[PDB]
């Protein structure tokens, strides 16, 4: 729900940002239309075309105000002020970004070290694309297919899954894709018994 | 001490319009009591001169339409400086004045008449008065940039990264 | 085509398979490159859909970070859509990529709008979209059709605006 | 008029890019991250170009004097005229820089020159640091 709230907030914020920006184009489109009608026709919105025949903006001349010490020095020192501001928020935003990056990054080094020091080794290991997920996952070939077995029903392929809850490693076979639970070990544990 | 810019400054005089009403005849009379009317302008000097004497495209159209405007030239040609003159009028609600200053350069070698130079823009809309587009554009752009910054920082907060997938939401 | 001698085969008025007259269509390097890239990616998508019928990743191709990455994506596209039997197509695509004035679709649309707002000939418009000229006279000499047809101020404005529109690499 | 014409075309393309990013954000499903980055960078650099070009031609914009058309009727379109006429900032930005100045708060001049010398010293120091190690 917070994601929906923030998405709506950013939508309305960008709409507010663009509403004021539209009026700049609405004003500035008038000059060319006054100078050249045909080029200017398409620039304005249909409502503004209906409002008036466009010849609105015409060139005019006004002199530049006489300069003095009064306003430039204050203008530039206050620009110094806003850019010192921008530097402050620059440092703050960079600090926040680096703190977030450091925390997350050390988290994936924690998982990374768990993976590195949890995996042992000869074994036929490769990457495969999951039928359901479509991503790349590690798989190990453990069947007797290359040892001389003619059993074609099963390929002896087990996918490696890092257990999120226990931070351990588990093997999921290809054939038994129906049992989805933690009781896989006992549900699949079969045996051969000889009675005399 | 915080001052509201005179460009956005808007004066309303309900008593004057109630007493006299809005007309081209007294539009300058309506403007007289406003803060925008400088007391150092030669128009006020002409006003006291008249008072003492009594006690003792569309530019050419409005030129030829009114005789008091004539009297305005024949009383204003003698005095050079900051003066208030009408720009255009469309009845019964729209009037705009022309804010220009005159320097009657009568020096030898200049065949042109007195120099007329703009100073300000004033628009009389209804009973209200209005007085740079560059500032408008930069203000709109900067507010748009602020809103964009807020949206982008929120979106980057929403962003989450994993090494094995990339960035997702 | 100094004197706009396009011949019968390339007349301004074209008769399509529907029998209606159409304006002759001319595309510069950017427009032609974008059109051919769009056609190739659409054909690749159709091929993938057909293969899935008999039996995400495409967003990265159109959006290229750099020229070299764009060229690598182009090579992959040619390998997966053309078969490598057409060297002339590869040479033309490389020439388009290396000397494409404009990479983004919106900027190309801006250039098209700027060039064809005046209503010039499609040949002249495509030539201006292909050639970047510093001065109006340079374009007028290098494009003899533009002589006597466009004012020098307008040509200078168009050339300066186009030079400003060029996306920095 | 040429300067305002260039401002017009550039601002029109900027508004077109804004409309673009708008109608690809309005979808109920968010596209890939990379497309969003490309759109952001393109539109934002375009805004930079807008700012630079508006900077370049301040004199032409200032010289122009605004005046309503004789043919334009104000009696019926006074609301539309007032809409474009108004220029006061949105309030939130106003108190935003008011709090910013509140937080920021011959002495000022000598701090200014001290900032000058710190800036120059830091620039020279990083030039030296870059020169210390061969980066080619």
């Amino acid at each position: 729900e917070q994601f929906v709230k923030r998405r709506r907030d950013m939508l309305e914020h960008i709409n507010l940002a663009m509403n004021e920006s539209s009026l700049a184009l609405e004003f500035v489109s008038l000059l060319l239309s006054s100078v050249k009608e045909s080029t200017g026709m398409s620039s304005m919105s249909p409502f503004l075309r209906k409002v008036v025949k466009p010849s609105s903006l015409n060139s005019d001349k006004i002199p530049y105000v006489a300069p003095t010490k009064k306003e430039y020095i204050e203008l530039d020192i206050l620009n110094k002020g806003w850019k010192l501001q921008s530097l402050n928020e620059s440092k703050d935003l960079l600090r926040a970004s680096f703190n977030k990056l450091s925390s997350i990054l050390q988290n994936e080094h924690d998982y990374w070290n768990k993976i590195m020091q949890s995996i042992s080794n000869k074994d036929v290991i490769f990457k495969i694309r999951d039928r359901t997920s479509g991503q790349k996952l590690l798989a190990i070939k453990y069947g007797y297919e290359d040892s001389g077995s003619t059993y074609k029903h099963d390929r002896g392929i087990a996918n490696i899954r890092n257990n999120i809850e226990s931070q351990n490693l588990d093997l999921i076979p290809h054939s038994s894709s129906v049992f989805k639970g933690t009781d896989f070990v006992h549900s699949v544990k079969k045996f051969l018994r000889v009675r005399i | 001490m915080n001052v509201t810019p005179l460009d956005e400054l808007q004066w309303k005089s309900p008593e004057w319009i109630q007493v006299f009403g809005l007309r081209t005849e007294n539009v300058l009379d309506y403007f007289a009591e406003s803060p925008f009317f400088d007391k150092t302008s030669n128009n006020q000097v002409i006003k006291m001169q008249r008072q003492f004497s009594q006690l003792n495209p569309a530019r050419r159209q409005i030129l030829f339409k009114y005789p008091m405007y004539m009297q305005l030239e024949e009383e204003l040609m003698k005095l050079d400086g900051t003066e208030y003159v009408l720009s255009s009028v469309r009845e019964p609600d729209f009037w705009v004045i022309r804010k220009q200053r005159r320097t009657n350069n009568s020096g030898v070698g200049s065949a042109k008449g007195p120099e007329i130079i703009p100073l300000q823009d004033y628009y009389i809309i209804g009973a209200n008065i209005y007085q740079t587009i560059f500032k408008i554009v930069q203000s709109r752009l900067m507010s748009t940039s602020y809103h964009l910054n807020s949206t982008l920082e929120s979106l980057y907060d929403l962003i989450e990264f994993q090494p094995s997938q990339g960035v997702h939401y | 085509a100094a004197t706009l001698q396009l011949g019968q085969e390339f007349q301004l008025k074209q008769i399509n398979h529907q029998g209606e007259e159409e304006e002759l269509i001319a595309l510069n390097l950017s427009e032609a490159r974008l059109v051919i890239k769009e056609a190739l990616v659409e054909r690749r998508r159709a091929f993938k859909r057909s293969q899935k019928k008999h039996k995400a990743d495409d967003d990265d191709f159109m959006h290229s970070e750099t020229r070299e990455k764009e060229l690598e994506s182009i090579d992959v596209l040619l390998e997966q859509t053309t078969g490598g039997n057409n060297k002339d197509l590869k040479n033309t695509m490389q020439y388009l990529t290396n000397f494409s004035r404009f990479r983004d679709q919106e900027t190309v649309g801006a250039v098209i709008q700027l060039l064809k707002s005046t209503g010039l000939h499609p040949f002249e418009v495509a030539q201006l979209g292909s050639l970047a000229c510093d001065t109006a006279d340079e374009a007028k000499t290098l494009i003899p059709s533009l002589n006597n047809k466009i004012s020098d101020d307008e040509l200078e404005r168009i050339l300066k605006e186009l030079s400003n529109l060029e996306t920095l690499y | 008029g040429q300067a305002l014409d260039a401002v017009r075309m550039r601002l029109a393309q900027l508004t077109h890019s804004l409309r673009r990013i708008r109608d690809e954000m309005s979808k109920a499903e968010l596209p890939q991250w990379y497309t969003l980055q490309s759109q952001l960078n393109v539109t934002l650099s375009q805004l930079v170009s807008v700012t630079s070009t508006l900077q370049h031609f301040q004199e032409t914009l200032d010289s122009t004097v605004v005046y309503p058309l004789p043919k334009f009727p104000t009696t019926s379109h006074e609301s539309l005229v007032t809409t474009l006429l108004r220029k006061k900032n949105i309030p939130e930005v106003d108190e935003w820089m008011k709090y910013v100045r509140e937080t920021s708060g011959e002495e000022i001049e000598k701090l200014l020159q001290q900032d000058r010398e710190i800036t120059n010293w830091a620039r020279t120091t990083f030039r030296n640091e870059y020169g210390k190690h061969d980066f080619k």
Partner: peptide
């Protein structure tokens, strides 16, 4: 020509922020 015109983005609902103060005589 022109690939596409701009959609009308008028905001009459915007309340505006005109400062009013010199009304008293």
């Amino acid at each position: 020509p022109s690939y596409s015109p701009t959609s009308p983005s008028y905001s009459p609902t915007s309340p505006s922020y005109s400062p009013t103060s010199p009304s008293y005589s």
